[PDB]
Symmetry: C2
Subunit: 494 residues, 2 copies
C-alpha cells in the first residue's frame, strides 16, 4: 500500500537524515527502524506531561559540504515528529499531489529499501535522455536557487500553497493549517524554517513549491527542480529572464526569494553534468570495464596520480564534490598491494575534508589497524580536527570506526568531544560505556540548566541512556516510556 509505505518511510527509514544514495550522512549504527507507525500513534495519543516552553527543539547534526561549509541536519524530537508524521499520513490523499509533479525530480516515491526520499535515485539512462530531450532546441540554461528553502520557509504559507493565499486568508479546521502547526511544533514553535533531513520537511517543501511549479508549468516553461534548485531550458534569452521574473513573483507569493548570487544563465550546449565530472571521468583509470576482475584492478601509480589530479581539480575548479566523486571512482577497484597507499591518502584527505571520512570504512578491514599505533594517532588527530572544526559527520563516522574496530581514544580528545557536545557523538560514546561518568556529568549539566530546548537538543542521548537504564527519563510525559516499552532503539545491533 502507498499509505502504509509512506508511514513506514516517514518513521522507520526517513526519520533520520538518510536521503543520500551511496553513503549516508550518519553512520549506519544509527537507525530509525524499530520505530513503527503504531508506536508513533501511541506517542501522538499521549497527552500527559507539561512543557514550560512551546514546541520542541531538535538534535542538530553539522555535516560538512565539499567546501567544508557546515550544513545543519536535524533529527526531530519523536513526540513532535510522531504527531507531524501521523498528520502527514492521515491526509496523504490531499498531500500525494506532490508525487504527480513532473518538474520536481527529488520527490516522494515508493522505493525498494523502504524510503520515500532518495537523492539521485534515477539511473543515468533516464537522466541522460531527460536532459538531452529538455535541452534540445533551446540555447539557454537557467540555474536559479531558492535562498532559504530550508532556513526561512514560511510555515504559515503551507495553507497558501494548498488552497491559495487569498482563500487561506479568508478562511482564517483545514489539514494544511494543522500541518503548519505540527511543522512549527517540530522546531520550537517557530514560524520560519524546517529541519533538514527528515522526509516530513521535504514533503512540506514539496507542498509549498508544487504551486510554484504548477504556475511555471502553466506558462509553458520547460524546467526541472531538484529540491530548491531550478534548471530551465529556454529557446531565447528573454525567455530565461521571463522565467526568472515569474519564478521571483511565484516565490515572493510564498515569502521566498531567489539566491541572487547563485542564479546564472549559461549557453546551451553545456555539459549534461558539471564540467569537472566529465574531466574526472575522462581521466578515470577505471572508466572502462574489461569483464575480467584481474584486468580492472588499479595499480598504485594510477590511483595515486588520479587522486593527485583530483586534488588539482578540486583546487582549480571547486565546482562540486570532486574529491568524493574521484574517491568513489577508485575505491572499489583496489588490489591488496595498494590498500595502504590509498588508505593513507584517504586519511590525509579526510583530515583535510571530513566528508571523505566515511570512505575510510570501505577499506577498514584490509588495513592492519593494530600495527605500530600510528593509525590510532591518525584517527585521534582526525577526531581533534572534527572537534575543532565543529563538524558532526566526520566525528560521528570516526567514532563509529574507532568503536567498531577497537581503536583506542585518549582522554584528551574525549575532553574535546565533551566540549563540542555533538549529540550523535555522545550517543556513540555512551554506547561504548567506557565514558559513563563524563556523559553523566554532561547530561547532569543539561538537566540542571532547566531549559527544555536544551534537553530537546540531546533527546537522542537522553533516550539512549534511558533505554539502557543508565539514566531516568528527563521528561515528564509518557513518550520516552512508550518508546522504551515497545523496544525502540536508535542504536540497534545487527
Amino acid at each position: 500500500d502507498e499509505k502504509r509505505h509512506l508511514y513506514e518511510a516517514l518513521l522507520r527509514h526517513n526519520y533520520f537524515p538518510n536521503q543520500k544514495g551511496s553513503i549516508s550522512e550518519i553512520p549506519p549504527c544509527f537507525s530509525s527502524r524499530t520505530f513503527t507507525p503504531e508506536i508513533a500513534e501511541l506517542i501522538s495519543s499521549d497527552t500527559s506531561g507539561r512543557r514550560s516552553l512551546q514546541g520542541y527543539d531538535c538534535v542538530e547534526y553539522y555535516a560538512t559540504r565539499y567546501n567544508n561549509f557546515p550544513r545543519t541536519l536535524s533529527i526531530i524530537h519523536p513526540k513532535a515528529y510522531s504527531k507531524l508524521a501521523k498528520h502527514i499520513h492521515d491526509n496523504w490523499e490531499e498531500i500525494r499531489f506532490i508525487k504527480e509533479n513532473e518538474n520536481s525530480m527529488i520527490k516522494p516515491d515508493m522505493h525498494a529499501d523502504g524510503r520515500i526520499i532518495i537523492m539521485n535515485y534515477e539511473d543515468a539512462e533516464t537522466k541522460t535522455i531527460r536532459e538531452l530531450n529538455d535541452g534540445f532546441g533551446r540555447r539557454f540554461k537557467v540555474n536559479a536557487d531558492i535562498s532559504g528553502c530550508f532556513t526561512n520557509i514560511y510555515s504559515h504559507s503551507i495553507p497558501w500553497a494548498v488552497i491559495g493565499v487569498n482563500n487561506a486568508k479568508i478562511a482564517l479546521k483545514h489539514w494544511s493549517d494543522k500541518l503548519d502547526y505540527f511543522q512549527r511544533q517540530a522546531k520550537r514553535n517557530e514560524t520560519h524554517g524546517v529541519p533538514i533531513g527528515p522526509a516530513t520537511s521535504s514533503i512540506v517543501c514539496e507542498i509549498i513549491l508544487s504551486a510554484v511549479d504548477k504556475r511555471l508549468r502553466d506558462d509553458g516553461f520547460l524546467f526541472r527542480r531538484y529540491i530548491d534548485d531550478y534548471t530551465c531550458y529556454c529557446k531565447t534569452h528573454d525567455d530565461a529572464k521571463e522565467f526568472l521574473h515569474l519564478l521571483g513573483m511565484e516565490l515572493s507569493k510564498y515569502k521566498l526569494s531567489l539566491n541572487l548570487h547563485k542564479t546564472k544563465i549559461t549557453n546551451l550546449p553545456g555539459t549534461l553534468n558539471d564540467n569537472w565530472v566529465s574531466l574526472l571521468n575522462v581521466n578515470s583509470p577505471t572508466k572502462k570495464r574489461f569483464t575480467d576482475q584481474d584486468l580492472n584492478k588499479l595499480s598504485s601509480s594510477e590511483v595515486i596520480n588520479f587522486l593527485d589530479y583530483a586534488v588539482q581539480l578540486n583546487t582549480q575548479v571547486g565546482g562540486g564534490s570532486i574529491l568524493k566523486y574521484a574517491i568513489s571512482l577508485v575505491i572499489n577497484n583496489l588490489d591488496e598491494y595498494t590498500i595502504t597507499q590509498v588508505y593513507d591518502y584517504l586519511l590525509n584527505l579526510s583530515w583535510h575534508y571530513p566528508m571523505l571520512i566515511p570512505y575510510l570504512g570501505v577499506l577498514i578491514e584490509h588495513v592492519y589497524l593494530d600495527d605500530g599505533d600510528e593509525y590510532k594517532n591518525k584517527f585521534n588527530e582526525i577526531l581533534s580536527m572534527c572537534a575543532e572544526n565543529k563538524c558532526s559527520d566526520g566525528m560521528a563516522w570516526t567514532l563509529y570506526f574507532c568503536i567498531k574496530n577497537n581503536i583506542d581514544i585518549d582522554d584528551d580528545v574525549i575532553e574535546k568531544i565533551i566540549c563540542f557536545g555533538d549529540c550523535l557523538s555522545l550517543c556513540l560514546l555512551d554506547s561504548s560505556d567506557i565514558y559513563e561518568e563524563k556523559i553523566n556529568n554532561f547530561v547532569s549539566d543539561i538537566i540542571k540548566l532547566d531549559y527544555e530546548y536544551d534537553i530537546d537538543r540531546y533527546w537522542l542521548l537522553f533516550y539512549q541512556r534511558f533505554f539502557k537504564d543508565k539514566a531516568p527519563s528527563p521528561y515528564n510525559d509518557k513518550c520516552f516510556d512508550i518508546m522504551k516499552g515497545y523496544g525502540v532503539d536508535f542504536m540497534p545491533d545487527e
Copy 2:
C-alpha cells in the same frame, strides 16, 4: 546651391581621399582643387582615343591602420571619375534621398570647407546626447560590420537598391544602371568593389545601404550606421538576434554579408566611446583647461609618461587608434623645452607605426633639422621602413616633410622608393626634379610594358610629368590635354 556644392565637392575636394577630420591620409601638397566641374564636363564630352582594355585602373595608395594593417585607398582616373561625378551630379534629385537617412551618420552633407564626406564631423555635444538617447531603456548593444562593403559590393545591385531587386530584374535607360556602368568603369570594368576614398563610391555605398537602413527602420529598430558598421540598441537579447538576422537577409538581398568575426553583442551600459578612449582621457595630463596658456603647458615628465602609458594601453588593449589619440591629446600643449624629447619619441613611434608620421609635421618647425645630420638619418630610416613595409601614407608624408624641410635623401633609399613604386611618392620625387632620370626610367618601363591598366595605376605621375612638360601624354585621348589646357594641377603651390 546644393547641386553646385555637390559637384565641387566631388571634384575639387573629395576626389582625393580627404574624408578624415583633423589630419589627412594624403599630405596637403596633393590637392584636387583647380579641377572644376566645367573641366570634368569637358572630359566627359571627349570621345576621342581608343582603349584596348575596358574600364580604367586607379592610383593605389596603401595607408596603414592602427594595427599596421594596410588599407587601399584609390584615386580614380579623371576620365572615369569625371564621367561618374557628372552622372552623380546630373541625377542628384534621384540620389539625394541618401541625405535624409537618419540612421547613417557619415553621409553626404554640405560642409563649410567644401566637402560632402567628413568622418566624425559632428561635435561631442550632439554625439553624446544621441548615444545617450539611443541607449536609454535598452540593455543590449549590437555591433555588426559588413565584411566587404568596399571590396565586394555588387555594382549590379545599384539598381536593386533604387527600384527594387525584382523591378530591376524585369526592367532588363534608368539612371541607376548608368551609375552602375560608370562605377564599373571607375575600376577596370569590374562588377565587384568600389575605390575607397572618393565620395562617389561613398555615395554609391550610401545608395546601396539606404534600402537596408529603410528596411531595418520600418521594423522599428533603433540603430546607427557609420559607413559599414551597424550599432543597434535593443531592449532584449532576442531583439538583438532578430536585428542581426534581418540585417543578414537585407544584406544578402544585395549580395552582401556580415563580418561574422566582427559582430558582437554587449551589455548596456557600456561606454559612449571605446574603453581605451576613457582610459586615455582620464589619464590625460591636458584634460583640464586653465584659461591661461602658461598653466596648460605640459612638462617633459608628463608627456613622456603619458606616451609610455599610451604605448602600454596600445599593447595591452589595442582596440583602436590609441597612440594617435594620445599624441593628438598632447601635441598641441607642448613648451619649447620639451620639443626635442616628444619629437624623438614621435620619430620612434612613427618608425614603428607609420600612421603617426603626419604628426611629425606639427613640430617640424621647432626642431633644428640641420643639427648634426641625425634627423636626416632618422628620416631616411623611416623611408627605408616605409619602402620595406609597402606603405604609401608614411612614405608620402615623410617625402613631403623631406622636400619641404630640405632633408637630403640618399640614393640607396631612392632605389627602394623606385622598387616600391608608390604613385604619390613618385609624384613627390618628380616634383623635386632631382631624380628626373630614375622617374623617366620608371615611366619608360610602364610605357614599354604596353598595359593600359599599368599606365592607369600611375596616371597621376604621368599627368604631373605631362603638365610640367617633362614627358608626353601616355594616352591617345584628349583628357590629359584638356586638363593641361585648363591648368589642372594636383600638386599646386600655396
